[PDB]
Amino acid sequence: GVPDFVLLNQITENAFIENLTMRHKSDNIYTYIGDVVISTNPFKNLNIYKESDIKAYNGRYKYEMPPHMYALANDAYRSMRQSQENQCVIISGESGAGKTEASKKIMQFLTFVSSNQSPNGERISKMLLDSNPLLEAFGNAKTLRNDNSSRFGKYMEMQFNAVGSPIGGKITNYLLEKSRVVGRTQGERSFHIFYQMLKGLSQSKLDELGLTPNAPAYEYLKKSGCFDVSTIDDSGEFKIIVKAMETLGLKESDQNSIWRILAAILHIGNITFAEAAEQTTVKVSDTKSLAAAASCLKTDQQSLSIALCYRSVISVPMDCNQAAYSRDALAKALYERLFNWLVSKINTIINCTTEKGPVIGILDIYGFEVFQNNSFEQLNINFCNEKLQQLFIELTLKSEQEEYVREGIEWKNIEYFNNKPICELIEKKPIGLISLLDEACLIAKSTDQTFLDSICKQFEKNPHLQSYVVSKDRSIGDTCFRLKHYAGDVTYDVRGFLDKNKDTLFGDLISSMQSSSDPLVQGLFPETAGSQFRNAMNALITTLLACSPHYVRCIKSNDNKQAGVIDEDRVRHQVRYLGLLENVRVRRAGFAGRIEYTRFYNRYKMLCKKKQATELILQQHNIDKEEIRMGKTKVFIRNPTTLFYFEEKR
Numbered sequence: 001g002v003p004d005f006v007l008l009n010q011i012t013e014n015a016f017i018e019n020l021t022m023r024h025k026s027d028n029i030y031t032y033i034g035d036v037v038i039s040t041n042p043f044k045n046l047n048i049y050k051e052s053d054i055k056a057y058n059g060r061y062k063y064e065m066p067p068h069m070y071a072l073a074n075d076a077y078r079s080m081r082q083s084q085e086n087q088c089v090i091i092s093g094e095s096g097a098g099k100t101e102a103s104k105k106i107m108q109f110l111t112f113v114s115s116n117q118s119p120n121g122e123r124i125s126k127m128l129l130d131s132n133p134l135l136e137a138f139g140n141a142k143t144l145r146n147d148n149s150s151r152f153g154k155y156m157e158m159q160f161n162a163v164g165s166p167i168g169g170k171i172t173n174y175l176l177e178k179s180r181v182v183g184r185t186q187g188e189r190s191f192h193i194f195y196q197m198l199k200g201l202s203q204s205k206l207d208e209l210g211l212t213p214n215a216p217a218y219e220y221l222k223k224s225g226c227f228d229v230s231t232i233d234d235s236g237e238f239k240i241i242v243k244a245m246e247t248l249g250l251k252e253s254d255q256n257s258i259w260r261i262l263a264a265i266l267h268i269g270n271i272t273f274a275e276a277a278e279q280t281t282v283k284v285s286d287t288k289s290l291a292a293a294a295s296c297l298k299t300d301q302q303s304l305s306i307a308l309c310y311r312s313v314i315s316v317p318m319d320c321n322q323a324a325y326s327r328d329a330l331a332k333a334l335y336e337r338l339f340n341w342l343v344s345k346i347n348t349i350i351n352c353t354t355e356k357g358p359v360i361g362i363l364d365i366y367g368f369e370v371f372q373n374n375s376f377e378q379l380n381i382n383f384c385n386e387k388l389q390q391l392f393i394e395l396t397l398k399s400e401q402e403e404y405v406r407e408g409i410e411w412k413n414i415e416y417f418n419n420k421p422i423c424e425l426i427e428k429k430p431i432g433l434i435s436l437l438d439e440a441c442l443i444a445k446s447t448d449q450t451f452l453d454s455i456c457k458q459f460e461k462n463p464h465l466q467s468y469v470v471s472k473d474r475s476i477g478d479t480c481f482r483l484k485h486y487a488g489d490v491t492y493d494v495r496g497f498l499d500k501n502k503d504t505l506f507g508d509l510i511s512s513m514q515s516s517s518d519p520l521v522q523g524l525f526p527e528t529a530g531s532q533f534r535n536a537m538n539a540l541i542t543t544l545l546a547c548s549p550h551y552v553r554c555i556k557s558n559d560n561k562q563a564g565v566i567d568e569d570r571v572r573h574q575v576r577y578l579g580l581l582e583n584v585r586v587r588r589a590g591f592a593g594r595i596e597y598t599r600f601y602n603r604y605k606m607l608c609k610k611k612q613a614t615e616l617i618l619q620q621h622n623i624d625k626e627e628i629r630m631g632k633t634k635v636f637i638r639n640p641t642t643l644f645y646f647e648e649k650r
């Protein structure tokens with residue numbers, strides 16, 4: 001087809017899709033838009049990620065070779081080495097577009113050209129890489145959109161020294177979908193590790209844990225009714241994780257310490273409750289499970305039981321519902337903590353505190369998703385994709401253009417459709433979705449329903465937000481509300497939004513765990529999830545705006561994981577809401593590089609005959625000014641080549 005869309009004959013959305021479909025059908029996943037990498041999920045292995053390929057793109061310039069993920073990594077690395085500044089790769093795409101795999105191809109590259117033979121160098125490399133399979137086991141799950149699906153945001157920072165060697169790395173994780181442990185969409189599956197452990201551990205360790213090799217045997221796992229995935233090999237996979245556990249310094253001592261907690265969560269899920277017609281209170285039925293759970297958690301079986309059936313020196317009995325609620329709340333707290341622990345545990349072996357040096361961050365977040373029923377989790381994941389989208393725009397389209405005028409470079413303002421910072425605004429500060437939901441949590445009387453009314457009244461005079469009430473549209477359920485995201489409309493069900501945002505665990509349950517003798521358990525137990533995630537995101541965004549950007553934009557080829565197939569409409573939608581066309585457009589009318597003035601002077605003199613300098617150097621080198629415009633403080637050079645010229649002459 002045609003690499004880099006700026007070279008499209010006729011710059012039109014249709015042309016764009018035609019070119020993209022053409023490439024994809026012939027296994028040409030990658031295409032450029034000038035430094036930006038556009039990739040289309042192949043849904044099958046393409047033998048193009050071999051070390052030889054790594055060697056092929058290493059050092060080379062973007063034009064010397066076919067568009068490839070590596071060219072981006074190579075630029076990021078070289079730039080870091082050169083300017084000695086921090087780089088960051090922001091990868092975007094819906095769920096299943098292929099962000100997780102791309103972020104790994106990027107590391108593979110860096111963690112290789114970066115080392116050499118240096119066994120020490122490639123040693124830590126081995127560690128940074130093994131961290132992926134490890135976290136993937138506890139943070140990924142098979143949703144309906146993706147068999148792998150990352151259920152947590154991740155920002156991986158590659159640490160190098162001035163010389164350019166891998167010295168370490170630190171991982172930053174974002175709000176995990178812990179609710180997936182106790183309940184999920186039928187057809188879907190819980191976190192991998194659970195299934196893999198059940199088919200990986202020896203019948204010995206299994207019995208010591210009170211477990212039976214069979215997912216159906218457990219409540220939490222049985223619910224969604226799905227225990228296998230043609231795509232995944234649980235048994236064989238578990239062996240990999242365990243290797244990784246050791247490569248990261250988690251001997252069979254730690255491994256077992258972890259296994260217990262997972263086994264405990266599994267047992268907790270089988271605890272049933274009965275009407276304790278004795279006073280009336282509620283009591284545990286499937287006692288043996290309650291025994292096994294307390295057995296693994298290494299705590300007093302009784303204290304536990306009492307924590308599940310009463311509140312708090314005064315103990316108020318609770319119904320079969322509040323009991324089941326607390327049961328699930330406990331399981332969720334355990335996993336969330338265990339996961340957060342696991343990352344810091346890794347960060348301990350990987351994060352270099354000694355040396356200080358340049359860093360290359362890689363962003364891998366949960367992509368935009370829409371299901372039959374969307375709840376609190378989806379709102380956050382999507383909100384997070386909204387922010388990321390807002391960032392691309394602020395950089396890639398708004399920023400670049402806004403300069404062209406500010407410098408005074410005759411510019412035909414190319415209007416990038418939706419600016420979308422309005423979908424953020426509708427959910428961050430005073431009088432915003434999560435801010436209302438937050439403040440509504442304070443009023444001990446309000447309920448999910450009363451909250452919906454706030455939103456519906458406070459807004460709906462504001463686009464992006466609809467409801468059956470105001471916009472008399474039956475599509476919106478009676479307990480739901482429509483949100484017009486940048487990537488399409490989504491309908492959230494307010495049910496459970498309060499207790500989800502409250503995110504509370506009663507002291508009785510906490511104390512019942514602290515009372516554990518297992519060093520790990522008690523280790524796990526030594527401001528609304530919403531407002532908190534809101535901070536994490538704003539923090540993340542300010543840090544990404546402190547590095548040199550490199551963009552990768554993944555496009556989901558189709559919703560059936562079909563290799564070599566394009567979903568015309570579906571892909572056309574993405575291409576549109578992403579603003580890729582308004583990119584090729586800008587890239588055209590615009591100029592390749594806009595090198596500042598004083599930076600040209602104190603750099604390109606030798607070529608020159610002995611902002612005044614700027615001009616002189618060009619005139620004495622002949623270059624159609626229809627290729628360069630003089631700015632108030634920066635110079636502009638339309639095409640790449642007419643810039644390679646000067647630089648290839650040094």
Ligand SMILES: Nc1ncnc2c1ncn2[C@@H]1O[C@H](COP(=O)(O)OP(=O)(O)O)[C@@H](O)[C@H]1O
Pocket residue numbers: 041042043044045046093094095096097098099100101102146148149150367554
């Ligand atoms: N480059 C690729 N080569 C082979 N399979 C791929 C590639 N990119 C994505 N996939 C397939 O798509 C699935 C989903 O990709 P993934 O990276 O997990 O998406 P995301 O991170 O955006 O949810 C993968 O686990 C894999 O089966």
Ligand code: VO4
Pocket residue numbers: 093094095096097099100145146148149150151365366367368
């Ligand atoms: O399914 V993915 O976009 O990792 O979330």
Ligand SMILES: [Mg+2]
Pocket residue numbers: 099100101148149150
């Ligand atoms: Mg993923």
